[PDB]
């Protein structure tokens, strides 16, 4: 499990997880609050 979590901590896996989180957050914000142009 230690070796597996080290693999999950390699740069592309962390990049995949973080960018999936960020893209999903942006997508769900735009789903819940459609068409934001201004604050």
Partner 1 sequence: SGLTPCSESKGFAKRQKNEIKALTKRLKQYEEGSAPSLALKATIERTEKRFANYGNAGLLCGTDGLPHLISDPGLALRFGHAGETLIPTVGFLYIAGWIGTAGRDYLIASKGEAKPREKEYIIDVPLALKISAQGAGWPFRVIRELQKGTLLEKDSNITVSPR
Partner 2 sequence: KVKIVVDGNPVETSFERWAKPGHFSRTLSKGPSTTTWIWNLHADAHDFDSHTSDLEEISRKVFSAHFGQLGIILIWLSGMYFHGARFSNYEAWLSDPIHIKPSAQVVWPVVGQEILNGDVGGGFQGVQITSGFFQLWRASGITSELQLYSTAIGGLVLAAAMFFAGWFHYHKAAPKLEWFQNVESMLNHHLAGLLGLGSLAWAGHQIHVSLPINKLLDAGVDPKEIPLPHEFILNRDLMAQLYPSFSKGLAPFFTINWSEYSDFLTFQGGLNPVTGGLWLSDQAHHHLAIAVLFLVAGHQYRTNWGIGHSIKEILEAHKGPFTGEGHKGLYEILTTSWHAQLAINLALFGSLSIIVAHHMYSMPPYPYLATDYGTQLSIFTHHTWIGGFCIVGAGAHAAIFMVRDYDPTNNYNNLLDRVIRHRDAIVSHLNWVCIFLGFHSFGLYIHNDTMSALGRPQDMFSDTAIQLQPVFAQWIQNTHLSAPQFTAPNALAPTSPVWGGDVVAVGGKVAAMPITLGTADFMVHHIHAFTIHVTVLILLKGVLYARSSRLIPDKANLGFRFPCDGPGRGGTCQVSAWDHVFLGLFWMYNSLSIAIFHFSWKMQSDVWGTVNSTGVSHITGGNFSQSANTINGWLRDFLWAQSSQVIQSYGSALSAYGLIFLGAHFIWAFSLMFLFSGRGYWQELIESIVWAHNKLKVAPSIQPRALSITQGRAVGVAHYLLGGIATTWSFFLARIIAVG
Binding mask 1-39 for ligand CLA (x = CB under 6 A): -------------------xx--xx--x-----------
Q: Report how far residue 13's alpha carbon sits from residue 21's, in angstroms, rounded to the nearest whole number.
A: 12
Could you say which residues in the range 17-36 bind partner 2, by CB under 8 A? 27, 30-31, 34-35
**Residues in CB range of 7: below 8 A, 6 or more apart:** 13
Q: Report how far residue 11's alpha carbon sits from residue 22's, in angstroms, rounded to the nearest whole number.
A: 16
Q: Which two tokens stand for residue 25?
A: 């957050």
Binding mask 13-32 for partner 1 (x = CB under 8 A): -x------------------
The binding site for chlorophyll a consists of: 28, 31
């Amino acid at each position: 499990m230690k070796n597996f979590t080290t693999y999950l901590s390699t740069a592309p896996v962390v990049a995949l997880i973080w960018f999936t989180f960020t893209a999903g957050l942006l997508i769900e914000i735009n789903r819940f609050f459609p068409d934001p142009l201004v604050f």
